[PDB]
Design a protein around this ligand. Structure first.
Ligand SMILES: Cc1cc2c(cc1C)N(C[C@H](O)[C@H](O)[C@H](O)COP(=O)(O)OP(=O)(O)OC[C@H]1O[C@@H](n3cnc4c(N)ncnc43)[C@H](O)[C@@H]1O)c1[nH]c(=O)[nH]c(=O)c1N2
Ligand SMILES: Cc1cc2c(cc1C)N(C[C@H](O)[C@H](O)[C@H](O)COP(=O)(O)OP(=O)(O)OC[C@H]1O[C@@H](n3cnc4c(N)ncnc43)[C@H](O)[C@@H]1O)c1[nH]c(=O)[nH]c(=O)c1N2
Ligand SMILES: Cc1cc2c(cc1C)N(C[C@H](O)[C@H](O)[C@H](O)COP(=O)(O)OP(=O)(O)OC[C@H]1O[C@@H](n3cnc4c(N)ncnc43)[C@H](O)[C@@H]1O)c1[nH]c(=O)[nH]c(=O)c1N2
Ligand SMILES: Cc1cc2c(cc1C)N(C[C@H](O)[C@H](O)[C@H](O)COP(=O)(O)OP(=O)(O)OC[C@H]1O[C@@H](n3cnc4c(N)ncnc43)[C@H](O)[C@@H]1O)c1[nH]c(=O)[nH]c(=O)c1N2
Lengths: 218, 217, 212
């Protein structure tokens, strides 16, 4: 069971996986039926020459809890399946991402980093209180929720294949992506490396365009 | 590793599956967490109201051997993964689909159905022999193969989710589709029913647009 | 309508196009807008921000043998509609390679004899098809004996990003020669309608060899 905590209340949990490195080998050769040195050489060959389609036969299902600003960027990856918690089939919860003062250390600010954390905490408390007041007064949830901030946490199931997951890592596991989604991508890369060590090693060696996966050990 | 033989030399083999009916239940509720009657009611609810996205979290991998005319129609389903045998990583084989005379029974023909079967075998034998002669003479395979007929068998891996598989069944498991692909679709439906009984039953009950799955068991 | 003849009887014809290089500029800025716009196209291409190129769409009418079409139809991020004979007239023509196609390979029989042997077997298969049709065998059954060089026609609606992926794979010497010819025609039409995008693609993103 793999569950990695992210940010202050998030997580990336592995729900299920179909296949391993050999699923890509089996799909490339088109045979059910092996040989570590030969099959690992095939994985590297496929990656080096751009034959990425065999990697689509390795599938993962994740359960991610993330703030709406992180989820909005994540959901931009169209070649995947998503099902977000809406409150139609299960209980809806209300938590927010408050950045720690360490997040701001590095930027020259006129007010202490701690004070920024305080100001953020304060406005989300006010918006949440306003939401509850509107709910208590009979305003439908769909209307009342529009005042809630972008740091509101949401939960979703993500079903994605290894090829689309590698595209996600190229873009999100990189210093140009927002720090919050970099953290989420590191957790995805960690679970991916655990289930597909050969594919992950070949990806870093031949196809990976980002920077943080070659520096940070997953 | 269920295998179903289709036609004279083809097959549909289940390579792998991720999840079951509960994977759609887990995705709809968004929880990795005991009432079969309540879970089956949710599957039926999702299917009646058109909330099909939870069914995308059930994935199948099939190994299919089919003639190129069947594969060309199959490969039109874009929301899926495919990897066909080309001869770059494994041995290439040469076999052909010869329809049995029973395939023609139902159509009033001027020549016996056995004569149609014979005419088809004759053509593949001559075309295949011509291919081998050109190969033996030093003509590259990519050129010599262009004379091979559409009934040449091919093999491929198909990775598809339950929602896209249900779209495939709506179109191919239907009397308006070619008989050959209907057989292949019946094998896919059989494997699907075995792994996802609740989803398959709900699909026939509310979402299935075809006709042969409601007649053939 | 641009039109390029490929092989003995095939073609690549431009049916329609939505947008130009500025459609990618407009989508990237989320605006309605010369040296700055071309610099943006090159920037987008060199940094991998490919999504603005999805807002340039093309529609092609392609006549190609089934062996070429089978590889083409593998590109899933596109729209296709092939002639089946349900709404319009079905035609039967075949790709016969010219002797020049075999020049370069040491063959035991002359290249003209290979061309002849190919015409012969496709004539026999086509005649067998017509005999089965005349005898009352449904087209869907009789056609299974037709060879892979039988020409088909289809409409292809694809955006510039997916078209660039197609060029990376098909406009390359490792692809079959017949496929290279069709990809050259697609690249030619693309260059004509999107000169800046095509030049930037060639400069930074293009992985193949024959377009350079
Ligand atoms: C430098 C830079 C700058 C920006 C941005 C990216 C980058 C790298 N983006 C983000 C961008 O628009 C997009 O959301 C992500 O790059 C999504 O990654 P994919 O397209 O790979 O994922 P996705 O899952 O959508 O696609 C995966 C792969 O499938 C293919 N694909 C899928 N759907 C396709 C389609 N419809 N047509 C063609 N190919 C398709 C492509 O090969 C693609 O890489 C952006 N966004 C934004 O809204 N505003 C902005 O200003 C920017 N800025
Ligand atoms: C009754 C009900 C209830 C809910 C919801 C829908 C409905 C009808 N939704 C919304 C739903 O999950 C979905 O995001 C949108 O309806 C988008 O619809 P498509 O996926 O059809 O469009 P999209 O544009 O993504 O795709 C168009 C079509 O392509 C196909 N398709 C695309 N990608 C596919 C893939 N990967 N596999 C298979 N087929 C694919 C399908 O045929 C689809 O209709 C939802 N959402 C949520 O997150 N939580 C919720 O609680 C609910 N609740
Ligand atoms: C009555 C009739 C007649 C014909 C045909 C079908 C039918 C029902 N066909 C076959 C048809 O064109 C098609 O190739 C297959 O039915 C594939 O169906 P999908 O596109 O639904 O599957 P696929 O698996 O590709 O897509 C699944 C779902 O995703 C969505 N989808 C995927 N890609 C999309 C995109 N780019 N834009 C929008 N939605 C997208 C759709 O919602 C679709 O149902 C045909 N074919 C042909 O070439 N010539 C013919 O003459 C005919 N004739
Ligand atoms: C060296 C080499 C060798 C081979 C092959 C290719 C190469 C480069 N192929 C061809 C290959 O399988 C494939 O059909 C083409 O490369 C099509 O490219 P795309 O998937 O990019 O196009 P497509 O148009 O399908 O998709 C465009 C882009 O969208 C994304 N994409 C689309 N659908 C996706 C999905 N479901 N999951 C993830 N990403 C998706 C990808 O980013 C992709 O580049 C092959 N073929 C074969 O059948 N057998 C073989 O042996 C070989 N051999």
């Amino acid at each position: 069971h793999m569950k990695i905590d992210i940010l202050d209340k998030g997580f990336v949990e592995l729900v299920d996986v179909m296949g391993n490195d050999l699923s890509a080998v089996r799909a490339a050769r088109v045979s059910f039926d092996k040989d570590e040195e030969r099959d690992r050489h095939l994985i590297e060959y496929l990656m080096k020459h751009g034959h990425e389609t065999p990697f689509e036969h390795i599938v993962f299902t994740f359960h991610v809890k993330a703030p709406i600003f992180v989820a909005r960027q994540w959901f931009r990856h169209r070649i995947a399946s998503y099902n977000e918690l809406s409150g139609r089939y299960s209980k809806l919860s209300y938590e927010f991402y408050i950045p720690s003062p360490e997040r701001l250390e590095g930027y020259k600010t006129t007010i202490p980093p701690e004070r920024v954390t305080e100001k953020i905490s304060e406005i989300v408390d006010k918006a949440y209180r306003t939401y509850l007041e509107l709910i208590e007064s009979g305003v439908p949830r769909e209307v009342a929720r529009i005042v809630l901030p972008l740091n509101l946490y949401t939960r979703f199931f993500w079903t994605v294949n290894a090829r689309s997951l590698m595209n996600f890592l190229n873009l999100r596991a990189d210093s140009h992506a927002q720090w919050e989604i970099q953290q989420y991508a590191l957790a995805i890369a960690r679970i991916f490396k655990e289930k597909c060590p050969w594919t992950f090693e070949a990806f870093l060696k031949y196809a990976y365009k980002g920077d943080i996966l070659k520096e940070v050990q997953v």
